[PDB]
Automatic annotation (TrEMBL):
Protein name according to UniProt: beta-lactamase
UniProt keyword list: Antibiotic resistance, Hydrolase, Metal-binding, Periplasm, Plasmid, Signal, Zinc
Highest taxon listed in the record's lineage: Bacteria
Modified-residue entries (Cysteine sulfinic acid (-SO2H)), positions: C169
Cofactors demanded by this protein: Zn(2+)
Gene name tied to this protein: blaVIM
Organism: Pseudomonas aeruginosa
Family per record: Belongs to the metallo-beta-lactamase superfamily. Class-B beta-lactamase family.
Organism lineage: Bacteria, Pseudomonadati, Pseudomonadota, Gammaproteobacteria, Pseudomonadales
Cross-referenced InterPro entries: BlaB//VIM/IMP-1, Metallo-B-lactamas, NDM-1-like, RibonucZ/Hydroxyglut_hydro, VIM-1/2/7, VIM-1/2_MBL
CDD domains to which the protein is assigned, alphabetical: VIM_type_MBL-B1 (cd16303)
Length: 232
């Protein structure tokens, strides 16, 4: 009823949307992994009379449910999607999207990692993002490669009309004590990558993590802190 939806409030298979700003929503879904349930976020950005989707809802059935929830709540077609790294909470559902007519995109690095690891593979390669600090425009957003962090390929997304920074899994929520799933992370470079985000987006008003509650710029420093302490 208006609060940001949480893991115990979303059954696995259902999707909720949350209005972040004019023409900007997050999507929230839940999924089981290794016998525990987790929430995860993505983004939806209005692109004239179409929508740009950032990240799947972590699985085929969740992503079908996402499309249905978008049709119910917004009613504009999703025409393009960008996945911000190669893990299943970002690309699982790309096959559903592609069969629904959504053009799916990711960096060449994400596409190679998804293919190698057996995850679903976005169709189109996003060039111009291979060096840390690179940025490219994609409809109503800017895509930014901050360097290795949660994964070597992680991208962040900025919505300049609303000063919304979607950090994806390179950014953790304020209540997080841990650095999340660090299986493919670079803990040594992660703080440097966060510093690049902080320098590049000093006017961000909302910061959205890949999992958990949005907040303000403090999520960036908090992420650096928790990663450094995990490494320690
Ligand atoms: C694990 C590798 C295969 N050996 C590929 C994995 C799986 N996976 C993704 C799909 C994943 C699964 C479960 C939990 C989390 C979290 C998290 C966040 N708070 N607590 C845990 C995170 C994150 O922090 O983004 N992501 C997760 C991921 O990230 O690595
Ligand atoms: Zn991940
Ligand atoms: Zn994640």
């Amino acid at each position: 009823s208006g609060e940001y939806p949480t893991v115990n409030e979303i059954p696995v298979g259902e999707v909720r949307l949350y209005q972040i700003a004019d023409g900007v929503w997050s999507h929230i879904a839940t999924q089981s992994f290794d016998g525990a349930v987790y929430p995860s976020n993505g983004l939806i950005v209005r692109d004239g009379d179409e929508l740009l989707l950032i990240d799947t809802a972590w699985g085929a059935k969740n992503t079908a449910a996402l499309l249905a929830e978008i049709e119910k709540q917004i009613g504009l077609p999703v025409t393009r999607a960008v996945s911000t790294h190669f893990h299943d909470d970002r690309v699982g559902g790309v096959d559903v999207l592609r069969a629904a007519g959504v053009a799916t995109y990711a960096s060449p690095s994400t596409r190679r990692l998804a293919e190698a690891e057996g995850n679903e593979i976005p169709t189109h390669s996003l060039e111009g993002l291979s060096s840390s600090g690179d940025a490219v425009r994609f409809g109503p957003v800017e895509l930014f490669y901050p360097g290795a962090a949660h994964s070597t390929d992680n991208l962040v997304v900025y919505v300049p009309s609303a000063n919304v920074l979607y950090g994806g899994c390179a950014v953790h929520e304020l209540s997080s004590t841990s650095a999340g799933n660090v299986a493919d992370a670079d803990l040594a470079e992660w703080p440097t990558s966060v510093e690049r985000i902080q320098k590049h987006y000093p006017e961000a008003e909302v910061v959205i993590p890949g999992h958990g509650l949005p907040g303000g710029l403090d999520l960036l420093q908090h992420t650096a802190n928790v990663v450094k302490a995990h490494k320690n």
